[PDB]
Design a protein around this nucleic acid. Structure first.
Lengths: 315, 178, 32, 148, 55, 40, 59
RNA sequence: CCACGCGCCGCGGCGAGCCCGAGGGAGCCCCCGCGGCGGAGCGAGCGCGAGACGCCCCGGGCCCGCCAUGCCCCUGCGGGCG
């Protein structure tokens, strides 16, 4: 398989890393959605109303014949203990006893992590996921950094390898959020940008602050990070050690064989463009002429179409 | 005001495009639909429908039944509609060429050792669109246990089974009990 | 399948909901 | 999910698909499986024969482990051997170095017969042998030895 | 309260909606109810020679 | 392959049009026959 | 005819003269070919489906 | 509405398999991770335990148990074969 190209902090080093095979696994958007929605819902904090909410007050129904609507009422006659009443218990109370987590079987979760990484290698998928990769020279961008602890020296690698545009737009947004979110402890939405994967090459100190950059170990690649917003196609930058260890991490699973590669839409279309099946195709019957109906009697021509001998009768 | 009711008996519901969100599976039906539209070859027509069937309707045709099915003519390619999973009950399996939507990891190994080729459906489209030298087989669709407990256990003319443990003499011992 | 072919349910009826010695438990304390 | 359900579409349709002449009232005909032999006899009988009535001898506390009897069909005995040895034991044949399968340690106690063992000498070692099983095994050449 | 008793009005339309369904070929010639001796003769004879379902 | 229109289409349309003319005249002769055949 | 007598109250019936047969088949004549209602505006249509019963033309 | 039991149905992974169980791991979304459910039934039990076909589907024919029974016989109201 063509060796990927390792780019140095300013210009490519003479380093070629064989494409790890995880990249050829089919890109299934369906599985990468099912695994994600379930995985994110897995990480939630339960919300409910008080069990003693509304039921705290005391109301014995006034009852029919006193002209009061029939609803439990307090000493004066105030609405209580009803969803339609002010201060009453919501008839169906919310619950802390919910299935907050939606479990996924291990094979399926690993399937998706591979599917996202292989979509990431497709350059087109990243562009669609709203990343300005036109500058980045070769995706997967394996940028060899021994160690970076200074933010400026990290900016340096990102600017030189054409990631500058992506990082700039992550700071450029940072708008205040829309709706009740501000008061709920999520005041700022910083648009997500590139993801840097490291294997013992410390890049944590230098790349953590910059906005839109997230750092993960090769050993753990969290789906929520591999696809922001349940969409596959992240801008991915790899420290040399991490990219080299991809096919090594992918042999740690005792029985995880990679999912078999499928065929793309273009290749199946090429198979139908192929003369093999073009030869099998044979022309069918010619479509039957339908037309519209006009009175033959009114026009000599229609009478001619229906009967040639009949039309010449007037002479 | 047309009374067309007497002539017909109502529309019939049938799958047209596989509902599976698997992109790869939609692509293959679309291809066998392009091929079927151009040439009316029936193999192509059944192929289109078999991909369209439900994941329960399409059954597992294990290699041992496959070998028994093709024992007379192993040369003929067999296009199994669904997942082929090998059965180790048949110790030795003969050379066979089978085109299936999925092959189990164990199955691939058994036909590979047997010198047989497990060619994928895309390869089938490339080589044999017509289905020449190809027989389209499928497993027992009635294999499912849910198919066995379907029905009305109780009424004498069912010969099916009640769902549960029951532990009840009433009705169990003969048509004269109950 | 409301009736017709259904199994007999093996569910013991929920006990002590409104009051009771806190029968229910939740596993939210397990991450911690 | 909450958005995609029959219930949401039915909002705006009065009694919400439970009918007008008879609505969804609380516990309409019984709480539980009530009416076993009276009001709901026709449903219980048409589908679940044998709901009511004692039948078997009662063992107050069964010893579950003693009751366990995993049984391996005399076809799957051979596929217990892995393929680095499966090819060899069959190709060689030979009584002197014949394969010996201890189904006890593989996790079964009694052998049953449901097929044909491949024609190679084999010494099965198990807790008990089924008549069909031993008849086929002895004929193939194989001997059934009882395990301790 | 005095109520209706029994009347077949409308029952005919319901039944003939798509009804009059033939009983099916499997029960057209089923072996239930046949002479016990006839059954043993048919099974033993078929087994020998051409219909050797036997091995 | 697309000579289907030239092959027995203008020719088949001509065959039908011409034979319609001959059929058109004899048919009319039978219809005229009824007015007197039954009358005589 | 026996069927007609059973359902006479709805229908109406008589022997059709050649010109009624002509005008109906020429001015309101429609074809059931392929289950559609293609209008028969030209001689070719009759031939495509009724040649095998020797009905080459509308006349 | 939410929970959990159930019966179907549509998907997704895998396949005589399959299984984020509690847990353990400097790990949090990642790695490892049993009982379980099937794979064999039937019989109240002693217990005994399916090959033979077949694109599918339907029957038909057979085989397994629970029953009766006729023979033959070993190690024996035990085994075999009807």
């Amino acid at each position: 398989n063509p060796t990927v190209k390792v780019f140095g902090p300013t210009g490519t080093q003479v380093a070629e890393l064989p494409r790890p095979k995880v990249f050829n696994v089919p890109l299934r958007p369906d599985i990468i959605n099912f695994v994600h929605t379930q995985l994110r819902k897995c990480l939630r904090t339960p919300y409910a109303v008080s069990r003693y909410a509304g039921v705290q007050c005391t109301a014995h129904s006034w009852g029919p014949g006193r002209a009061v609507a029939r609803l439990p009422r307090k000493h004066g006659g105030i609405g209580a203990y009803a969803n339609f009443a002010r201060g009453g218990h919501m008839a169906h109370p919310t619950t802390v006893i919910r299935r907050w987590c939606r479990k996924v079987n291990l094979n399926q979760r690993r399937y998706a992590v591979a599917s996202a990484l292989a979509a990431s290698a497709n350059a087109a998928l990243v562009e669609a996921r709203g990343h300005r990769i036109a500058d980045v020279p070769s995706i997967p961008l394996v940028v060899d950094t021994d160690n970076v602890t200074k933010t400026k020296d990290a900016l340096a690698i990102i600017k030189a390898v054409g990631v500058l545009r992506d990082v700039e737009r992550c700071k450029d947004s940072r708008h205040i959020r829309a709706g009740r979110g501000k008061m709920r402890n999520r005041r700022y939405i910083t648009r997500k940008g590139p993801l840097v994967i490291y294997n013992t090459e410390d890049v944590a100190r230098g790349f953590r602050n910059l906005p839109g950059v997230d750092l993960c170990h090769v050993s753990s690649i969290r789906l929520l990070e591999l696809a922001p917003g349940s969409h596959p196609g992240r801008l991915i930058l790899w420290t040399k050690s991490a990219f080299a260890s991809l096919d090594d991490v992918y042999a740690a699973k005792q029985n995880y064989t990679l999912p078999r590669s499928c065929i793309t839409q273009t290749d199946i279309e090429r198979i139908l463009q192929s003369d093999a099946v073009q030869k099998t195709f044979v022309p069918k019957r010619d479509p039957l002429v339908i037309e519209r109906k006009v009175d033959p009697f009114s026009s000599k021509e229609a009478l001619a179409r229906l009967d040639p001998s009949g039309t010449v009768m007037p002479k | 005001g047309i009374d067309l009711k007497t002539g017909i008996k109502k529309r019939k519901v049938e799958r047209k495009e596989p509902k599976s969100p698997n992109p790869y599976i939609r692509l293959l039906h679309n291809a066998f639909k392009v091929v079927y539209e151009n040439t009316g070859e029936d193999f192509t027509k059944v192929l289109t429908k078999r991909l369209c069937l439900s994941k329960t309707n399409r059954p597992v045709l294990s290699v041992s039944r496959l070998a028994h099915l093709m024992h007379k003519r192993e040369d003929k390619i067999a296009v199994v509609a669904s997942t082929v999973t090998n059965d180790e009950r048949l110790v030795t399996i003969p050379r066979m060429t089978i085109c299936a939507l999925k092959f189990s990891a164990t199955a691939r190994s058994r036909i590979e050792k047997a010198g047989g080729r497990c060619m994928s459906f895309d390869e089938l489209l490339a080589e044999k669109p017509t289905g020449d030298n190809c027989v389209l087989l499928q497993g027992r669709r009635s294999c499912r246990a849910v198919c066995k407990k379907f029905g009305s256990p109780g009424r004498p003319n069912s010969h099916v089974k009640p769902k549960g443990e029951h532990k009840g003499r009433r009705g169990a011992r003969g048509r004269h009990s109950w | 399948a409301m009736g017709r072919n259904v199994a007999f349910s093996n569910m013991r009826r929920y006990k002590c909901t409104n009051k009771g010695p806190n029968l229910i438990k939740n596993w939210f304390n397990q991450p911690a | 999910p909450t958005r995609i359900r029959k219930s949401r579409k039915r909002r705006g349709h009065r009694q919400m698909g439970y009918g007008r002449v008879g609505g969804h009232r609380k516990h309409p005909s019984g709480r539980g499986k009530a009416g076993g032999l009276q009001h709901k006899r026709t449903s219980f009988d048409k589908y679940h024969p044998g709901y009511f009535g004692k039948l078997g001898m009662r063992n107050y506390h069964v010893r579950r482990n003693i009751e366990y009897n995993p049984t391996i069909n005399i076809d799957k005995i051979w596929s217990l051997i892995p393929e680095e040895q499966r090819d060899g034991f069959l190709q060689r044949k030979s009584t002197t170095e014949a394969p010996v399968v201890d189904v006890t340690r593989f996790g079964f106690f009694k052998v049953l017969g449901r097929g044909s063992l491949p024609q190679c000498p084999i010494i099965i070692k198990a807790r008990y042998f089924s008549s069909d099983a031993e008849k086929k095994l002895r004929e193939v050449g194989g001997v059934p030895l009882l395990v301790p | 309260a005095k109520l209706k008793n029994h009347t077949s009005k409308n029952q005919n339309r319901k039944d003939h909606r798509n009804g009059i369904k033939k009983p099916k070929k499997s029960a057209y010639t089923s072996h239930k109810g046949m002479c016990p001796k006839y059954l043993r003769n048919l099974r033993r004879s078929r087994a020998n020679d051409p219909r050797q379902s036997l091995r | 392959s697309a000579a289907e229109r030239a092959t027995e289409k203008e020719k088949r349309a001509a065959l039908v049009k011409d034979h319609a003319v001959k059929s058109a005249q004899v048919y009319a002769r039978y219809y005229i026959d009824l007015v007197e055949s039954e009358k005589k | 005819l026996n069927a007609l007598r059973i359902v006479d109250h709805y229908v109406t019936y008589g022997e059709p003269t050649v010109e009624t047969i002509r005008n109906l088949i020429y001015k309101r004549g429609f074809a059931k070919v392929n289950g559609q209602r293609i209008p028969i505006v030209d001689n070719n249509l009759i031939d495509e489906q009724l040649s095998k019963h020797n009905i080459l033309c509308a006349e």
